[PDB]
């Protein structure tokens, strides 16, 4: 019966909670209490990218750590040479309501999407010397919140129809559909081995998905509001989520638990973007208070503040070599911090 | 100093800057209207009058003014996650069916369609992103409401109604019950029309209201207001 299955579900949730509490001998703060703090972290704006004429909604770094793509709602996706502040490309979008952008690991493609329900794949290296739309992926029935390349031929998108999808680009069809979220999936993050990906939605829960099997392996709760951002730890065994209740949280995959909460009393605004440093010691988070906060990820102390934007810090990224942090904001200026 | 290819890349970047600035100057001369309404509220009729999945963008030029209309009716997802994308629109065109004062919602019974439209208008008008964004309100199907009001009194919808069962008193009552949901009466203004079937009398009203909004934005830019 319905009621019997609901009772079984409640029993299994109690079992999961008891098994999580059983292997919770010590907290992360009880072991990291003896290591040295990182001290005051001061990063100065090195490069300001003055090319966007409207709110920037996403940015992604290239693998080479020099080029960065940035998407704004003026209809322009701009590829930037961050060393010289040059403009390598400016791509006019068919729909100007772009909410995400991705840069392929090979560097040959970029992607974007948004309120048009379509993920557009743009080829950068053509014989004609311009950037053309190589593909348009349709099939999502809500706004497309986050996209990330696996390789040249495979992409993972997360939309506002409570689903994620793994697409084969050259056919244009969803290879896999990931269902299970009951709210708008707002972000995703790929593991370094690109076999598992986590996704945070608007039901205050994150889920870990196996790309190959298309099934949800673990569900992580603990937030009290919409999860607007998520990012793996660099070894792939943990991740951090940013939410609307002014807290970041560090969850562990193998222990199936929240490890750390990053929150301060003087912080009430919501997190829109999280990222780690190269070693994972720093956790950077963009907030709606127009400022970025750098947290000691092992000690939950606010190590530093990146305060250089006049509007909400909408997007944030750290290079592969860890040399710089790029923040993009609603006041149209990307800034490179170091 | 720079090499030859570095100088040519800088020249490429400056040409890209010029094209971006020209495209921004072209895009800043266009009027963006966010189209909003309830289910089956006559949004489609409004779109057809203006012309003559995801975002449905409409383009129409009137009196050498270029209007872009963004219909977001197919977004079944939560509204508060994408509504801030439309913070810089010129105006919000809200469509309300006047013949919904007796109908009930097909999704949920015991909830009036007119009350649901009033709740949606309350959510949009007093939202924190539209603190100073004016609202053009359209009250569709006035002939249907005229026919229905004689047979069916308005007091099933609004139990505080005291006026007569005529078209004009009931229509002005519904207009007042929609206009008084504006909390920020000083910073934003509500323009109301009754969706006349006559050609170039609805898009004429949109042109007049957008001209008023442009004059008020220019006054706030010059420091006079």
């Amino acid at each position, epitope marked *: 019966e319905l009621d019997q299955l609901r009772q079984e579900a409640e029993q299994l949730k109690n079992q999961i909670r008891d098994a999580r509490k059983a292997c919770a001998d010590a907290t992360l703060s009880q072991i990291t209490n003896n290591i040295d703090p990182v001290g005051r972290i001061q990063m100065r704006t090195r490069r300001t990218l003055r090319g966007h004429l409207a709110k920037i909604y996403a940015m992604h770094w290239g693998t080479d750590s020099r*080029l960065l793509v940035s998407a704004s709602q003026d209809g322009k996706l701009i590829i930037w040479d961050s060393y010289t502040t040059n403009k*390598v490309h400016a791509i006019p979008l068919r729909s100007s309501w772009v909410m995400t952008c991705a840069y392929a690991p090979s560097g040959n493609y970029v992607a974007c999407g948004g309120l048009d329900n379509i993920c557009s794949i743009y080829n950068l290296k053509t014989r004609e010397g311009n950037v053309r739309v190589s593909r348009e992926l349709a099939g999502h029935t809500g706004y497309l919140s986050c996209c990330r390349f696996l390789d040249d031929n495979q992409i993972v998108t997360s939309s506002g129809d409570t689903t994620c999808a793994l697409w084969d680009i050259e056919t244009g069809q969803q290879t896999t559909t990931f269902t299970g979220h009951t709210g708008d999936v707002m972000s995703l993050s790929l593991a370094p081995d690109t076999r598992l990906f986590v996704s945070g939605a608007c039901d205050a829960s994150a889920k870990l998905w196996d790309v190959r099997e298309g099934m949800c392996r673990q569900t992580f709760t603990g937030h009290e509001s919409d999860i607007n951002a998520i990012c793996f730890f660099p070894n792939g065994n943990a991740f951090a989520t940013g939410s609307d209740d002014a807290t970041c949280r560090l969850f562990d995959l193998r222990a199936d638990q929240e490890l750390m909460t990053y929150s301060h009393d003087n912080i009430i605004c919501g997190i829109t973007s999280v990222s780690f440093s190269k070693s994972g010691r720093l956790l950077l988070a963009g907030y709606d208070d127009f400022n970025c906060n750098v947290w000691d990820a092992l000690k939950a102390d606010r190590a530093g503040v990146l305060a250089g934007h006049d509007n909400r810090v909408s997007c944030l990224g750290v290079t592969d070599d860890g040399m710089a942090v790029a923040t993009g904001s609603w006041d149209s200026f990307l800034k490179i911090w170091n | 100093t720079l*090499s*030859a*290819e570095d100088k040519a890349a800088v020249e490429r970047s400056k*040409m890209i800057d010029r094209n971006l600035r020209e495209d921004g100057e072209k895009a800043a001369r266009e009027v963006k209207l966010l189209l909003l309404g309830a289910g089956e509220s006559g949004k489609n009729t409004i779109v057809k009058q203006m012309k003559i999945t995801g975002i449905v963008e409409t383009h129409f030029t009137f009196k050498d003014l270029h209007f872009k209309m963004f219909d977001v009716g197919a977004q079944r997802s939560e509204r508060k996650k994408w509504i801030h994308c439309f913070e810089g629109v010129t105006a919000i065109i809200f469509c309300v069916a006047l013949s919904d004062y007796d109908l009930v919602l097909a999704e949920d019974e015991e909830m009036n369609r007119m009350h649901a439209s009033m709740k949606l208008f309350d959510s949009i008008c007093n939202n924190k992103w539209f603190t100073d964004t004016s609202i053009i309100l359209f009250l569709n199907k006035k002939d249907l409401f005229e026919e229905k009001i004689k047979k069916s009194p308005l007091t099933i919808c609004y139990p505080e109604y005291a006026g007569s069962n005529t078209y004009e008193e009931a229509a002005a009552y519904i207009q007042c019950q929609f206009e008084d949901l504006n909390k920020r009466k000083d910073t934003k203004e509500i323009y109301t029309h009754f969706t006349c079937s006559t050609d170039t009398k609805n898009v004429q009203f949109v042109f007049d209201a957008v001209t008023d909004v442009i004059i008020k934005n220019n006054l706030k830019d010059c420091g006079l207001f």
Partner: single-chain antibody
């Protein structure tokens, strides 16, 4: 399909004038810088002129400075070289070359077929290809050496060395751009390695297609200068 077609050549009396046209089809012409590169009938390539995308910067070789004028018309996708007071030194096969410049771009990647012009009767970087002929056998690995007078390694890490191949009867073709980067559509076997001033181009497992004249070009400073060219023959 990308094509540059040159027209306007012929026999011109000395002191005369002639206008060359290059019609471009199959690519976004207004975003490519364009070069004119002539070739004497028994001698190596020589750079003539360059106009940028958007016609901002125009450079000429010292030989043709004042006499020649390069211009472009972007809506008609056409490139003009107006030549006045032609001497007998301007007898050459002229090539229209496209080149785009951004981070990681490949300049000098496509060359037109060329038009034939027959005229009847100090601080420039010297690029040196010491050997002029290396007889090779198919299936072998050969090295082509090129020495520069001034070091081509810039302070930004890029060494602006460009290796081109001209098969017999065809236009030159880009093989290596910026010392080590293999051009698009070029086979794996070609590989460039350089040390500031001395550069080598290695062709392992040589094939019949590979025979022809190889030129090294610098791009560090204008005027762009080519080597004399090293010729690979059969047997």
């Amino acid at each position: 399909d990308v094509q540059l077609v040159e027209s306007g050549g012929g026999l011109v009396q000395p002191g005369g004038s002639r206008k060359l046209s290059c019609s471009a089809s199959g690519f976004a012409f207004s975003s490519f810088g364009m070069h004119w590169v002539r070739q004497a009938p028994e001698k190596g390539l020589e750079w003539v002129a360059y106009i940028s995308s958007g016609s901002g910067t125009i450079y000429y070789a010292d030989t043709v400075k004042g006499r020649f004028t390069i211009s472009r018309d972007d809506p008609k996708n056409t490139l003009f070289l107006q030549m006045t007071s032609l001497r007998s030194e301007d007898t050459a096969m002229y090539y229209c070359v496209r080149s785009i410049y951004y981070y990681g771009s490949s300049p000098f990647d496509f060359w037109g077929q060329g038009t034939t012009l027959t005229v009847s009767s100090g601080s420039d970087i010297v690029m040196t290809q010491a050997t002029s002929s290396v007889p090779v056998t198919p299936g072998e690995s050969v090295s082509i050496s090129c020495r520069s007078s001034k070091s081509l390694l810039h302070s930004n890490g890029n060494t602006y060395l460009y290796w081109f191949l001209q098969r017999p009867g065809q236009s030159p073709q880009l093989l290596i751009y910026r010392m080590s980067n293999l051009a698009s559509g070029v086979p794996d076997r070609f590989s460039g390695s350089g040390s500031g001033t001395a550069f080598t181009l290695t062709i392992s497992r040589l094939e019949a297609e590979d025979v022809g004249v190889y030129y090294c070009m610098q791009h560090l400073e204008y005027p762009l200068t080519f080597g004399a060219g090293t010729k690979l023959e059969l047997k």
